């Protein structure tokens, strides 16, 4: 019988489809002049509508790739899989929702890359004595957790410009420790020392040849070093089938963007790779510091897990920084960094436990809702993260996507991807807002009262000035008229008090009991 579609959209095909998912449009054009074209499909079949001329699109979630999740990351012919399905083609008509499930699993024995960023100001000298044997001691500890470990090295002090560095006397530019008995290296901003190597003894060999620097202020500019270690993939050597850890060790504050204006540096950091062939951050004295948002974005794009391994007196500060950069960890470092190995192992455990999802390239007309089927079967509505997992344990996520309105472009794409994992799920969204009968619309047709409107999908659609089944009469002087003859007798009411009179032609209003037709709306 009557429904929402019956009395909501009766003017166009797109208006019919936008009313509700259940609406259908009978674009059959042998139907009499004016009919319930827009209503449910079943009664359109009952209305003797042609089965081939019925516009009824059904939203669906079609999977395109469903490779099975891998059991071991050992052997790894670039074929380990951690997210299934991998590609899904989603087709959504407007004001409708579709749901699909994904399964994320942390494959056992996955290769790992560790890049050791180390602050190297003068108060960080004794640490250099308790790191000289980290390549051999970390290889033994992390051999049980993974079968392919690669380790690198870095350094940084601060920008070498104006009030940060000493420029007097002239003998202090060669070594800033002129006043002290000892001598230090000329001050640098960031120098890449050792690229990610499978050989482990190279870390010991290339860390015994280092030496400290000295700058004036207390904060040290390590955010520049983090950015340059992140965006220079080819120089650093980051793998693609591995877990990226960036162990960033410091014992003082850090410089943030706009803090470089004290040196005369106003150009914003653009987040590109500037480390040359001399292994030195070249644009150090010309570009500002990286802000928190840009640093987070570059960490996200390259799949880096950042570990602030900092001393006690500043731990709180970095904790409050770790709440603004998702995916990081904070660890407590001794004065002489005699416990950085255990810090690294525990932080790796904490990274590997949690599973968190993130959405990339999501457009403004789509909304998503997650239901985490975590351990056992206890769904946790609204949650897109699980904690307290192990190695090899799998979690499931149920996703529901809703669309508001008809998007301009019927071909978009976005990504559902666990944070820190290479593997991602790609959704290709197609919006079915336009029916096929609107493509062959014929304008200025004689079928719309001598080209006074467009004739598509079997219905005249005309603009201002005219209205009706075929845009017959004008409303310029239609209100004052003697064409009141819409009933058999003068004393009788118009349309039997059951419809509206338009230009001397009764149109029956909708009824919940059933359909109303007739010249004077006297039928049922």
């Amino acid at each position, epitope marked *: 019988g009557p429904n929402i579609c019956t009395t909501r959209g009766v003017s166009s095909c797109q208006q019919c489809l936008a009313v509700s998912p259940m609406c259908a449009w009978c674009s059959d054009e*042998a139907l009499p*002049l004016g009919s319930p074209r827009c209503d449910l499909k079943e009664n359109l079949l009952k209305d003797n509508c042609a089965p081939e001329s019925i516009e009824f699109p059904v939203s669906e979630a079609r999977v395109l790739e469903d490779r099975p999740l891998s059991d071991k990351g050992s052997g790894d012919s670039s074929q380990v899989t951690q997210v299934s399905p991998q590609r899904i083609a989603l087709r959504l008509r407007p004001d409708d929702s579709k749901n699909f499930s994904i399964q994320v699993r942390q494959v056992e024995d996955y290769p790992v890359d560790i890049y050791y960023l180390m602050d190297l100001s003068y108060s960080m000298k004794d640490d250099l004595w308790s790191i000289q044997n980290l390549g051999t001691k970390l290889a033994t500890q992390m051999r049980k957790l993974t079968s392919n470990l690669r380790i690198g090295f870095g350094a940084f002090v601060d920008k070498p410009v104006s009030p940060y560095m000493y420029i007097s006397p002239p003998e202090a530019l060669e070594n800033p420790c002129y006043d002290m008995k000892t001598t230090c290296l000329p001050m640098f901003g960031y120098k890449h020392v050792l690229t990610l190597t499978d050989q482990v003894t190279r870390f010991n060999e290339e860390v015994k040849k280092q030496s400290v620097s000295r700058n004036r202020d207390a904060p040290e500019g390590g955010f520049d070093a983090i950015m340059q270690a992140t965006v220079c993939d080819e120089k650093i050597g980051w793998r693609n089938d591995a877990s990226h850890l960036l162990v960033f060790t410091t014992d003082a504050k850090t410089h943030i963007a706009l803090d470089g204006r004290l040196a005369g540096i106003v150009q914003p950091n653009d987040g590109q790779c500037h480390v040359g062939s001399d292994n030195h951050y070249s644009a150090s004295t010309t570009m500002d510091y990286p802000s928190l948002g840009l640093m987070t974005e570059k960490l996200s794009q390259k799949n880096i897990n950042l570990i602030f391994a900092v001393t006690e007196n500043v731990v709180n500060l970095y904790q409050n920084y770790s709440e603004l950069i998702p995916g990081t960890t904070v660890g407590v470092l001794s004065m002489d960094s005699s416990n950085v190995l255990q810090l690294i192992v525990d932080a790796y455990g904490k990274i590997r436990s949690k599973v968190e999802l993130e959405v990339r390239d999501l457009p403004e007309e789509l909304s998503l809702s997650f239901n985490a089927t975590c351990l056992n079967n206890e769904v946790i509505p609204g949650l897109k993260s699980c904690m307290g997992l192990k190695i090899g344990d799998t979690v499931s996520f149920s996703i529901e996507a809703k669309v508001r309105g008809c998007p301009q472009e019927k071909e978009k794409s976005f990504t559902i991807k666990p944070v820190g994992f290479k593997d991602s799920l790609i959704v290709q969204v197609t919006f079915d807002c336009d029916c096929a009968c609107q493509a062959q619309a014929e304008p200025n047709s004689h079928r719309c*009262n001598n080209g006074n409107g467009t004739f598509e999908c079997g219905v005249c659609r005309c603009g201002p000035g005219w209205l009706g089944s075929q845009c017959e009469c004008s409303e310029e002087d239609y209100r004052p008229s003697q064409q009141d003859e819409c009933s058999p007798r003068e004393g009788q009411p118009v349309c039997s008090q059951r419809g509206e009179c338009l230009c001397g032609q009764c149109v029956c209003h909708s009824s919940d009991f059933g359909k109303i037709t007739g010249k004077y709306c006297e039928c049922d």
Partner: antibody
Amino acid sequence: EVQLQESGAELAKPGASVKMSCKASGYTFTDYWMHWVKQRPGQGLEWIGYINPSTGYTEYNQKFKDKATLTADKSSSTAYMQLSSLTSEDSAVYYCARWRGVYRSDVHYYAMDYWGQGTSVTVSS
Amino acid sequence: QIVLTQSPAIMSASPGEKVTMTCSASSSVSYMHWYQQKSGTSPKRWIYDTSKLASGVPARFSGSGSGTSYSLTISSMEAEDAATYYCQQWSSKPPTFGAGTKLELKW
């Protein structure tokens, strides 16, 4: 306008196919549709099919369906109808009728207008 | 499908007489058109929406009625109006034609 011209009589053996033509001269041949009406020799005018010349929307009649396929040629401005699987009971006169728009008698969509001369189809072996 | 039955199958009248034809529908059709086909098998159009004369029709033919039974009236019939008249409905979606009424002349 308006003149519709039909082809001459066709003799067909049972089980064959027929190629009816209706050549339209006048108006535009893209703003008025075309019907096909069968007339048995014992009275009784039967609606057959339908075609919009711009886009081939062929709505068919009471249990005709595959027994008549309608096509159009907008270049030569001519509407064709193909009868398939002929039987001895299909020996009647086939007309092609236009379709009044603009007014189209308020709601009764049908006005036809300008019928063709009528092509008698004779079926025998 | 709506079935249309024209009650008088064969008629005859003298020149200068009143003639009436009836086409009674089966499902309360709004509007009903009448086609005239002479001897020669080519039915023209004669009346549309059951009260309006198509161009070229004289001012003698009239149509009246509503609901389920319509009628066509001829006043002062000459020898030029002797054909078969068919009724069309097209308010359902079979457009069905009437069986037709034959009209003759008295002599």
